[PDB]
Amino acid sequence: AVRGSIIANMLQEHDNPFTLYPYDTNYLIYTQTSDLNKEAIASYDWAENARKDEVKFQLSLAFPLWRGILGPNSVLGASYTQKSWWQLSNSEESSPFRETNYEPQLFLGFATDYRFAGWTLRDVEMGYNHDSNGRSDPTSRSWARLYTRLMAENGNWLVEVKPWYVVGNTDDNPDITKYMGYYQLKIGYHLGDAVLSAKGQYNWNTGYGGAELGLSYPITKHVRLYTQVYSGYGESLIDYNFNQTRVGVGVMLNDLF
Ligand SMILES: CCCCCCCCO[C@@H]1O[C@H](CO)[C@@H](O)[C@H](O)[C@H]1O
Ligand SMILES: CCCCCCCCO[C@@H]1O[C@H](CO)[C@@H](O)[C@H](O)[C@H]1O
Ligand SMILES: CCCCCCCCO[C@@H]1O[C@H](CO)[C@@H](O)[C@H](O)[C@H]1O
Ligand SMILES: CCCCCCCCO[C@@H]1O[C@H](CO)[C@@H](O)[C@H](O)[C@H]1O
Numbered sequence: 001a002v003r004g005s006i007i008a009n010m011l012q013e014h015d016n017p018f019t020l021y022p023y024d025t026n027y028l029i030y031t032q033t034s035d036l037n038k039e040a041i042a043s044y045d046w047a048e049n050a051r052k053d054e055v056k057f058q059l060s061l062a063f064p065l066w067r068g069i070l071g072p073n074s075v076l077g078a079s080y081t082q083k084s085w086w087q088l089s090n091s092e093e094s095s096p097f098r099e100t101n102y103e104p105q106l107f108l109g110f111a112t113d114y115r116f117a118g119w120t121l122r123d124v125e126m127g128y129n130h131d132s133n134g135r136s137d138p139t140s141r142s143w144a145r146l147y148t149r150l151m152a153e154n155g156n157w158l159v160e161v162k163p164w165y166v167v168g169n170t171d172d173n174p175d176i177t178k179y180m181g182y183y184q185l186k187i188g189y190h191l192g193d194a195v196l197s198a199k200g201q202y203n204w205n206t207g208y209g210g211a212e213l214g215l216s217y218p219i220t221k222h223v224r225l226y227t228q229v230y231s232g233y234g235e236s237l238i239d240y241n242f243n244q245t246r247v248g249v250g251v252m253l254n255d256l257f
């Protein structure tokens, strides 16, 4: 059961306060994109010398703020997630960071046990999300969402849906919905210790969207070899309206399950 189940995991108490909880996946991979969006970041010095090969990484942690707030198997929690695109090899430019996306959340989560013809709905999570790239104009992007996260498992499968509703200011990128849509779908499949996964969003009206396929395998007890292939719009905020295909290879700690 407790395999990829975020909320139930947060409920399990740690003896050491400095032992964190994983929310999303944690990885650092060496990537190569098909197109490096220069239009958007043109304001930057290095902009011209921008290379199509960046070190991409994602950090993702959850913090239980208050267990049992709404009954047993409930938690008022927070998570922090950060994706970074880093022109590491771009030595002529002093290895700049092209983009970072800071994504903190505040939610009410529940660990559950509903049945769906084989499936079990394990997580039901409802919260506020903020995602900005901490840039001063013009390369500044930001948007906010009220969201619901639902995860269910059934054998080697995991399915998580995340519908959302936009709230707050969207001026840095008013039309962001046109590229992101109204929800995120995520599928994981366990083939032994190999984990195949897919994560995506798609605005069924505008035809815009994006996908991310992944495959990982344990290098050791805690670290995995991870291969990623992103294609489409919205890889990062600064490229939300930019299309691209990105293949990368690197290491991972936790996968979706
Ligand atoms: C975990 C391994 C990755 C190590 C990366 C080194 C830490 C550098 O840190 C990065 O510096 C950038 C420079 O402004 C910031 O934009 C990023 O937000 C920050 O993560
Ligand atoms: C929409 C609000 C999400 C539901 C979360 C509230 C947590 C309740 O918890 C649920 O209670 C059910 C009893 O009816 C049990 O059958 C489920 O296994 C249990 O997870
Ligand atoms: C299901 C409830 C989840 C608790 C979410 C924490 C929400 C606190 O988040 C708040 O949401 C407001 C939206 O009404 C925004 O205006 C505030 O800026 C934001 O801080
Ligand atoms: C638990 C099942 C819910 C899955 C979430 C999918 C809902 C996203 O559905 C979207 O809702 C929008 C709002 O009206 C519509 O404009 C879009 O056409 C529709 O795709």
Ligand SMILES: CCCCCCCCO[C@@H]1O[C@H](CO)[C@@H](O)[C@H](O)[C@H]1O
Residues within 6 Å of the ligand: 187, 188, 189, 196, 197, 198
């Ligand atoms: C989101 C990740 C993409 C999922 C595609 C993986 C398809 C899994 O495919 C499954 O493989 C099993 C073992 O070979 C078979 O027994 C099942 O019949 C088959 O559905």
